[PDB]
Every structure is written in structure tokens, then in C-alpha cells.
């Protein structure tokens, strides 16, 4: 079972970040033949049904699978979170404020809170900042981690008014490249909320 946890992690890294360094033949849409991946050293211990299990029982739908042809087999991608340049990846462009989700919200942790207040939310390594289109139940909402302590909400219409684009992934995640350096500046911060161990509001600028 942990092997499924290990399979997902190895799948996440290879499909999101390390593929052109691993030799895999990935297209500009982020799709790679699954067999060529399962031929890699770290993947040689897994079966196409193991990967199939991880793809369907995954609650965040991190990976998409496509039939392909028999000469290539199944095509497998990650839906979001890429360090690689995949310009043709399936993304819904949220170009007007009326297409945006009800609320944009990023959940993070105290260790990073002072840097976010002073520099803004950063893409960090990834190509897009990851936001949720809502808060979760007592919930696994995709686009947000599970053990977050504080959540900060984003003013979507104001960011768009300043030419900061937004995108929706095929698994419900909202993405933005930020500004030039990959930062969502603290001006587009509308509201903040501490989540654990008690729901309390947090102050900003
Ligand atoms: N200026 C700043 N200074 C200091 N820290 C800053 C900062 N700006 C942001 N940070 C924080 O630095 C980390 C970012 O780095 P990351 O992108 O890898 O973290 P994330 O949570 O966004 O992860 C994305 C998806 O990836 C996973 O999806 P999976 O389930 O693994 O498939 C997740 O669940 C998500 O859905 C976060 O803590 C940021 O708050």
C-alpha cells in the first residue's frame, strides 16, 4: 500500500518536474507514454494496473490517463503542478472576472506567513501559484493541502485588472503565474483566516 504512496510520489515528480532530465519523451501538453516511464529505474517495479489503481483512487485527480494508440500505449500526465514547460497543457483560461470561481483561497503554514506578508505568494519552483475555488469540509478540496494552518483569500478581479492571468486545471485547481518574478503581491490579498487549531481572522497590511 505504501508502495502506492511511493508510486504517486515517483509519478508526481517525474510527470511534474523530472522527465526531460530522465529521458522520457513528453510532449508540449505534458503527456508521456506510460510504458516508457514504467521502464525507468524507479518505475521498473510497478505494473500498469498499479499505476491504474493510483490514477483512479486518487482523491485530488493529480493524474490524467488517455488511451493513446497500441504503438504507444496509454498516455499519462499530471493535471497541474509542473516545473516543466508544457505550453499545450489542458488549462481553462479564466480571462474575465465573471469566469472566476466563487472564492480564491491559498492555504499555507505559519513558517512561511512572514515571507508571504512581505513578498507575496510565490510560484516557488512550479510555474503557477495554486489556489482552491473554495474551503473544505470537516474536506480534501483540490488545489489546497490537507494540514494547512492559515488560509489567505485573493482578490481575483483586481489581479485580472492588473493583467495577472488565471487558469483552471482539469481537476479543479486555479493557477496563476503571478507577476514577472512569480509573486502574487500582498495588494491582491483580500482576507486571511487561521484554520487550526481554531478559526480566527488574521491581520494584514
Ligand atoms: N513568498 C513566499 N515565501 C515563503 N513561502 C512561500 C511564499 N509563497 C508561497 N510560499 C509557500 O511555499 C510553498 C510553495 O511551494 P509548493 O507550490 O510546492 O506548495 P503548494 O501547497 O502550493 O503545492 C501546490 C500543489 O501541489 C500539491 O498537490 P499534490 O497533492 O502534492 O499533488 C498541493 O496539495 C497543492 O495542491 C507553500 O507553502 C507556500 O505557501
Swiss-Prot record:
Keyword Transferase (UniProt): yes
Molecular function via GO: tRNA 2'-phosphotransferase activity
Tissue: Widely expressed. Weakly or not expressed in lung, spleen, small intestine and peripheral blood leukocytes.
GO BP, sorted A to Z: tRNA splicing, via endonucleolytic cleavage and ligation
UniProt-listed Enzyme Commission number(s): 2.7.1.160
Coiled coil spans: none
Keyword NAD (UniProt): yes
Sorted UniProt keywords: Acetylation, NAD, Phosphoprotein, Transferase, tRNA processing
Family: Belongs to the KptA/TPT1 family.
Protein's name in the database: tRNA 2'-phosphotransferase 1
Organism: Homo sapiens (Human)
Amino acid at each position: 500500500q505504501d508502495r502506492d504512496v511511493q508510486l504517486s510520489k515517483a509519478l508526481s515528480y517525474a510527470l511534474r518536474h523530472g522527465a526531460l532530465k530522465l529521458g522520457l519523451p513528453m510532449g508540449a501538453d505534458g503527456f508521456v507514454p506510460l510504458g516508457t516511464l514504467l521502464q525507468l529505474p524507479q518505475f521498473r517495479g510497478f505494473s500498469a494496473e498499479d499505476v491504474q489503481r493510483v490514477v483512479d483512487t486518487n482523491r485530488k485527480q493529480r493524474f490524467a490517463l488517455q488511451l493513446g494508440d497500441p504503438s504507444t500505449g496509454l498516455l499519462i500526465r499530471a493535471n497541474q503542478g509542473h516545473s516543466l514547460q508544457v505550453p499545450k497543457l489542458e488549462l481553462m483560461p479564466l480571462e474575465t472576472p465573471q469566469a472566476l470561481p466563487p472564492m480564491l483561497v491559498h492555504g499555507t503554514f505559519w513558517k512561511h506567513w512572514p515571507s508571504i506578508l512581505l513578498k507575496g505568494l510565490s510560484c516557488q519552483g512550479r510555474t503557477h501559484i495554486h489556489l482552491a475555488p473554495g474551503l473544505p469540509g470537516d474536506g480534501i478540496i483540490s488545489g489546497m493541502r490537507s494540514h494547512c494552518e492559515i488560509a489567505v483569500f485573493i482578490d481575483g478581479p483586481l489581479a485580472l485588472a492588473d493583467g495577472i492571468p488565471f487558469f483552471r486545471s482539469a481537476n479543479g485547481v486555479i493557477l496563476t503565474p503571478g507577476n514577472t518574478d512569480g509573486f502574487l503581491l500582498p495588494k491582491y490579498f483580500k482576507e486571511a483566516l487561521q484554520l487550526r487549531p481554531t478559526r480566527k481572522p488574521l491581520s494584514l497590511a
